[PDB]
Design an enzyme around this catalytic site. Sequence first.
Site, PDB file in Angstrom:
ATOM      1  N   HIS A 146      -7.294  11.737   2.319  1.00 20.47           N
ATOM      2  CA  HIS A 146      -6.432  10.776   2.996  1.00 20.47           C
ATOM      3  C   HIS A 146      -6.159  11.256   4.429  1.00 20.47           C
ATOM      4  CE1 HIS A 146      -6.089   9.666  -1.185  1.00 20.47           C
ATOM      5  NE2 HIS A 146      -5.281   8.654  -0.957  1.00 20.47           N
ATOM      6  N   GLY A 203     -11.977   5.953   2.630  1.00 16.21           N
ATOM      7  CA  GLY A 203     -13.385   5.620   2.657  1.00 16.21           C
ATOM      8  C   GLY A 203     -13.976   5.521   4.074  1.00 16.21           C
ATOM      9  N   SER A 204     -13.143   5.501   5.117  1.00 12.77           N
ATOM     10  CA  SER A 204     -13.672   5.359   6.470  1.00 12.77           C
ATOM     11  C   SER A 204     -14.429   6.625   6.884  1.00 12.77           C
ATOM     12  CB  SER A 204     -12.607   5.033   7.455  1.00 12.77           C
ATOM     13  OG  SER A 204     -11.775   6.171   7.641  1.00 12.77           O
ATOM     14  N   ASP A 220       0.810  -1.208   0.000  1.00 13.75           N
ATOM     15  CA  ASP A 220       0.000   0.000   0.000  1.00 13.75           C
ATOM     16  C   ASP A 220       0.854   1.273   0.000  1.00 13.75           C
ATOM     17  OD1 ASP A 220      -2.458   1.551   0.361  1.00 13.75           O
ATOM     18  OD2 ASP A 220      -1.870   1.791   2.452  1.00 13.75           O
ATOM     19  N   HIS A 221       0.539   2.187  -0.916  1.00 12.06           N
ATOM     20  CA  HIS A 221       1.062   3.541  -0.987  1.00 12.06           C
ATOM     21  C   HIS A 221       2.582   3.566  -0.980  1.00 12.06           C
ATOM     22  CE1 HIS A 221      -3.153   4.968  -0.476  1.00 12.06           C
ATOM     23  NE2 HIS A 221      -2.679   6.078  -1.050  1.00 12.06           N
ATOM     24  N   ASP A 272      -8.022   0.863   7.179  1.00  6.45           N
ATOM     25  CA  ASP A 272      -6.904   0.861   8.118  1.00  6.45           C
ATOM     26  C   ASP A 272      -7.365   1.423   9.483  1.00  6.45           C
ATOM     27  OD1 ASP A 272      -4.481   0.822   9.438  1.00  6.45           O
ATOM     28  OD2 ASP A 272      -3.699   2.631   8.403  1.00  6.45           O
ATOM     29  N   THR A 273      -7.645   2.730   9.546  1.00 14.23           N
ATOM     30  CA  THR A 273      -7.850   3.384  10.844  1.00 14.23           C
ATOM     31  C   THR A 273      -8.998   2.754  11.619  1.00 14.23           C
ATOM     32  OG1 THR A 273      -6.987   5.486  10.032  1.00 14.23           O
ATOM     33  CG2 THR A 273      -8.144   5.548  12.107  1.00 14.23           C
ATOM     34  N   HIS A 316      -9.649   5.228  -1.584  1.00 14.89           N
ATOM     35  CA  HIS A 316      -8.820   5.613  -0.451  1.00 14.89           C
ATOM     36  C   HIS A 316      -9.585   6.611   0.439  1.00 14.89           C
ATOM     37  CE1 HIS A 316      -5.018   4.706  -3.098  1.00 14.89           C
ATOM     38  NE2 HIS A 316      -5.875   3.670  -2.990  1.00 14.89           N
TER      39      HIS A 316
END
Lengths: 268, 268, 268, 268
Positions: free
Chosen positions: D167, D191-192, D82-83, D213-214, D189
């Site tokens: 982001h 999306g949370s 990722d990234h 992730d978060t 990216h």
Amino acid sequence: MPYVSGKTMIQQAWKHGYAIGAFSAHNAETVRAILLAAQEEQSPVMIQVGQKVISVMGLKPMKEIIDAFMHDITVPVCIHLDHSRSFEQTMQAIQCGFQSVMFDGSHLSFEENVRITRAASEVAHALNIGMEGEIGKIALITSCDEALRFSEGTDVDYLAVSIGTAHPKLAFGRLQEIREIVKKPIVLHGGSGVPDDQIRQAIALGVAKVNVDTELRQAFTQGLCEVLTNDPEEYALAVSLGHGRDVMKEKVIEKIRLFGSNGKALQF
Amino acid sequence: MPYVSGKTMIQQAWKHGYAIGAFSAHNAETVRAILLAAQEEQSPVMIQVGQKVISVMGLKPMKEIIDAFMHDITVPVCIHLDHSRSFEQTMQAIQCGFQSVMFDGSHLSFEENVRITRAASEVAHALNIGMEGEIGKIALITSCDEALRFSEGTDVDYLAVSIGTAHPKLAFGRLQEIREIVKKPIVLHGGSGVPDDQIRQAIALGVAKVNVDTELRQAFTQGLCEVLTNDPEEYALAVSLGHGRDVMKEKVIEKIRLFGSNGKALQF
Amino acid sequence: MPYVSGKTMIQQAWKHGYAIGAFSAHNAETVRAILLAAQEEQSPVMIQVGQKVISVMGLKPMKEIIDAFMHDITVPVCIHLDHSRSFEQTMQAIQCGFQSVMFDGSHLSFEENVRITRAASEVAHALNIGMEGEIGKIALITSCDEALRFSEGTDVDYLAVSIGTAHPKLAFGRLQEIREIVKKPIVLHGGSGVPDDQIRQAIALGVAKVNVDTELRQAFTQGLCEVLTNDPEEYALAVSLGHGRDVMKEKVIEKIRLFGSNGKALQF
Amino acid sequence: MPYVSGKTMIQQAWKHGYAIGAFSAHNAETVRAILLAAQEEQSPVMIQVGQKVISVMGLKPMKEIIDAFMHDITVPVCIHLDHSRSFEQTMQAIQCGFQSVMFDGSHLSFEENVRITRAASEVAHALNIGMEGEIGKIALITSCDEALRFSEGTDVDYLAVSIGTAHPKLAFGRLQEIREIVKKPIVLHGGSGVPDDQIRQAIALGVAKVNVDTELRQAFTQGLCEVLTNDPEEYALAVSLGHGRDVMKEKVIEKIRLFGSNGKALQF
Ligand SMILES: [Zn+2]
Ligand SMILES: [Zn+2]
Ligand SMILES: [Zn+2]
Ligand SMILES: [Zn+2]
Ligand SMILES: [Zn+2]
Ligand SMILES: [Zn+2]
Ligand SMILES: [Zn+2]
Ligand SMILES: [Zn+2]
């Protein structure tokens, strides 16, 4: 393992006035013959996986066979992909952990040879892997200009040029000029068709990697025939293929000594 | 991998009235010949690593060479340690992930054969590995009583007995009696010195594993000689050792068909 | 790797008057904390895989996590199976390449403890793996006679006895007597419930392996709480679990120094 | 393993109107939480190794930790870098056998983003590895033209664009236009920070990979705090970090269901 980058190994040989033998392997006995030769001679060595063995055994299986025989080996060993003509194949060798690759674009235009070799070179250099390339022409001997343009456009670590062999009288003057202008180690291809004295002088002038294939298979086959000529009912592969291995090991030892790499493992 | 326990593989063959060929391998070409034979025939197969190859190539290197050639193999394969006379060696095979081991204590007293075989059997059974043992005597043919006492004292999965071969007329009646009393699969040793018709009948009576070594090396050597007899200057190992491989592959196919395991990979 | 047999590591510590810390690991951060501690202190170290982590993460996965974090570690490391009560589990640890195992039969009769421990000891010794066993009794402190009978019947390399801890005042006289009569290194269990001064004296008298688990998890948890107490919205595991790791690393360093193994990696 | 190319996995999700969750992992418990979630839900899944975990644990160690926990997993799994902002790092992920990589050149000029992304894309495509790239601009929302020019110049399999996250309101019309003109799957990216209903509609319009992730680390931390809030002297990492794992597993399950990939493992 005691695997070492081809960039490191060849540059060291070139700096110190000797060459690394790049010995083509074809199966279990032949891999072992090379490794045992190198260990006995306390020599750095390259083991080449070339196009013929890839068609028979596979690239990744040969890598894994070399790994299997490294258990008791402490000298510097570099596994090298020989005469790849495929970007994809070169990437496969990189992925399974080869320490040196060759993309041979000498069948392509100058611009395309440079473009593909360069692309492979960027991947190899990202992962500390040695990179070889080859040029012929852009009369049958490569010019300094051609060698310099190729070297600069690709960033190869070591390069093969058209120097008087065939895949025979070596172009010693040209090789000397190439050392001063290009300032990279040279790889000899087709060196088995050249006398020992000529090999020694090429190495003094900057050849730091010498490819050996047919001469090893000839030594292996001669061992086999000798046992089977004497006794066609000798069914122990330990004896028949074993003697082939011993006769091939002696050939490798002979080449190591010719190249001047015996005793050089301490230097790493 | 598609590696399968020898306990599973042999018990299945025994239950269904066929045998597993246990084919001794000695190098890269010979491993591949066996695997390709098994894949083409859609057959379960054992590959044996025996004492000769261990002295030449090493136990762990042979295991790793087999692993290297499994990449495209989907049929059931079991790697078996053949005729170990060392508890230590048997433990090494267990540690590097063999799927079947044989401790041959037939040179020891009955009590010591049982004691060491049993100790190896407890380790194998802890890790789902097949266990073979061997008994001769406690006139030259093993008695039911001896076979039962050995089987019960050791808990081997499969057992070799003195049944009329040498390491030749098979003791069919005895084998029949052994199936009913001992109720375990039998392993044949020295079966190459016995006609096909006799092999087929032994399998019908409970032989579920048949060891093959010399016959494969004879087929391999015959391929080699044929190429090199024609052309001693054939230096391509792809051609010489390749033809050996093809002739050995055909032999393996022939044995698979004799044993009745062709087509049985679906059953797993 | 720089993995070393537990037999070698413990015997060396015992010979030279220091102990090896056997630090229980439970996950990625905790493995790394131990290894980084050992590398910084230039200390030999054992990493224990015990019954709790096996129930959570699995035995083979923990082995593979340790392997993953060894990439930059040059000090002697030994992976040890802690307090196995299963012959099968002990065999699994041997098979995936542990360098030390403990079969704890102290819940069994003397005869059965000896019989199973001995059987595991024969496998470990076949493969150059260290072997630990434990005895309590055959008043609550193990007698010399019991320790000698256990040691001799099992052939363990190192042994735990009932010496005044619980799983607390150490039986120093008894430990001294055990060194002279049994002549093997002693392992301390439950040492976290004993003062530092007492630990130092036990090591002077022959304790060469000291198990540490709860004290590390307490240090880890204290790091976690501290970050999360300050800031419950700290969602970077790098920060929260990271600080736990740092606080646990410091604890490991403290234990290494207590045990006297700091600086001893040169000795190997 | 049951590892599958990211090219295959994402294209399948896109073809069938669901998305693959790309779940960022940070250690042992978090890897396991994702895998167990996927197995229970019979879902294909991506596990992301991103820049934070690479700085803490290392790229190759995380790969090896994922491998360690695949032992009992039968659903399609793809490990994704990722990234990455480094060609070298991207090559390292390719070399250790990742099944998908992202080179994020969105901080570079259009020409340089294209040039480096394209070079990485040629390596990935040589080895059957999925390739992701990202573009912002060449008003804050990516134009069709920009997306098409980027897609065509790089040959990425899937692409992230500036679509209304950071982001946060998604540019649904633009996404629709991108599906028809660019004809490749889109990666979301950030999306949370967007409601569930919006996520579902983005997937209906061509989003086939959603990075998480978060939200997972928040769920993990909440599990930890809950145990340690109740009982600060709970020193069993099995209990504290275990509960974190369970709460994170539930979050992953929730995301799988949102994305619509539950039950889709049969389709592979
Ligand atoms: Zn050549
Ligand atoms: Zn050439
Ligand atoms: Zn035999
Ligand atoms: Zn026999
Ligand atoms: Zn304990
Ligand atoms: Zn204990
Ligand atoms: Zn992102
Ligand atoms: Zn992004």
